[PDB]
Symmetry: C2
């Protein structure tokens, strides 16, 4: 229930119609009960190609978020997540807690890149995948460990030991659940490696706003994850 | 002139002995007149391999920074940079300015990865390099544009239009100068693409603390940039 005095959405988001890097931002917006505009592929490619001076903020790739209330534009998913966390009051009250939240979002940003071999010409093979599994397990344990130092269990608690869901929880939950729900090998690795991260992620996305976002994303995007050709190769190795 | 009451350095930094991703953090520390401990390759590999629960904070790759005064550990270079910016009072006073500073550090983190083909098995060829040049030019212009909206010129001003050097300036200056000084093709691209980013970067690293860090890094690391085999292949294409 927050829009402008002419009824326009407070936020304007540019990100591809796949539940990938910008899904983490859509999750933060949805959790906090925000409404936002989206754009199609042609509009997103246009924004990338119009020249630095004509962009809302100079950026390389999406997501890009415009905050119409503050007349402010931001790119880089980790910068957008922490910005929204401050703006929407879902970060911890300490510099330490805010800083760990930045660490966790950057870690998430990194896992997304490693899952997709940095979105370039490199494809998965069964061999690259088997090499990667232990590293993916290590990433899962990096998340599980920060939770564990803050009292996290499968059944209760949040990532940074807070009273409520914060950015850290949202980004963690959307990262792991989105890929789990689409690639059975990865789902099995998460379940086998960290029950505590499984439980936290599944509790967070069971909340009404995120359960509704998850369903709406399936109905809009089908089974897409990233996708392009890189998705096809991940499907071959991680199903 | 800030250490602990027993004289130990306030900060403890783990990063490889190359002027690469952690150089941006060394720059922030040096600019603010801080002293910090460093570690050798065996110690860094040890910290990576000791298990999540035994790390100062769970992390994948360095840099890792321990703040002994606050008893706080942080990884992810963009999270460390912004943490230090707050701790050492060299960030803008607005959420917008802090957030753009996060964007710029993430952009820097990304340029470092693209220069080194994500630190994996992929090597440069002359062909991949020619394809990359326009993208590198685009990155340079992304930095130049944010400067330009804040009044930046070659000869004066800072990235975010501030009274003094902030994180954004330091990370920008160290990113571009370090690679320029080691790869003549890249130096020529920066000079030809954005005189304003050239001038800002060269003004910032002319300051006494950063001029001393630059020299100390050459004497400790030789001509190394990243290096490993990926450095050898970059040298072949970008000299």
């Amino acid at each position: 229930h927050h829009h402008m005095e002419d009824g326009m959405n407070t936020f304007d988001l540019y990100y591809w119609p796949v539940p990938f890097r910008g899904q983490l931002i859509r999750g933060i917006l949805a959790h906090c009960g925000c409404s936002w505009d989206e754009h199609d592929v042609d509009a997103i490619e246009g924004l990338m190609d119009c020249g630095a001076e004509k962009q809302p903020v100079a950026f390389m790739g999406p997501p890009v978020l415009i905050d119409r209330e503050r007349n402010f534009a931001i790119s880089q998913m980790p910068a957008i997540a922490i910005y929204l966390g401050e703006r929407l009051d879902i970060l911890p009250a300490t510099v330490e807690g805010r800083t760990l939240s930045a660490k966790i979002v950057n870690d998430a940003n990194d896992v997304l890149d490693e899952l997709t071999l940095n979105g370039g010409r490199e494809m998965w093979t069964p061999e690259k995948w088997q090499e990667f599994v232990p590293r993916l397990q290590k990433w899962i344990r990096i998340f599980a460990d920060t939770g564990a130092r803050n009292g996290l269990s499968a059944a209760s608690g949040f990532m940074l030991g807070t009273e409520k869901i914060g950015v850290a929880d949202i980004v963690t939950a959307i990262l792991w659940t989105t890929v789990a729900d689409r690639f059975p090998a990865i789902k099995g690795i998460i379940e086998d490696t960290s029950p505590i991260i499984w439980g936290l992620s599944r509790r967070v996305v069971a909340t009404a706003p995120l359960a509704a976002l998850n369903s709406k994303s399936f109905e809009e995007y089908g089974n897409a994850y990233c996708g392009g050709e890189i998705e096809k190769s991940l499907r071959k190795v991680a199903s």
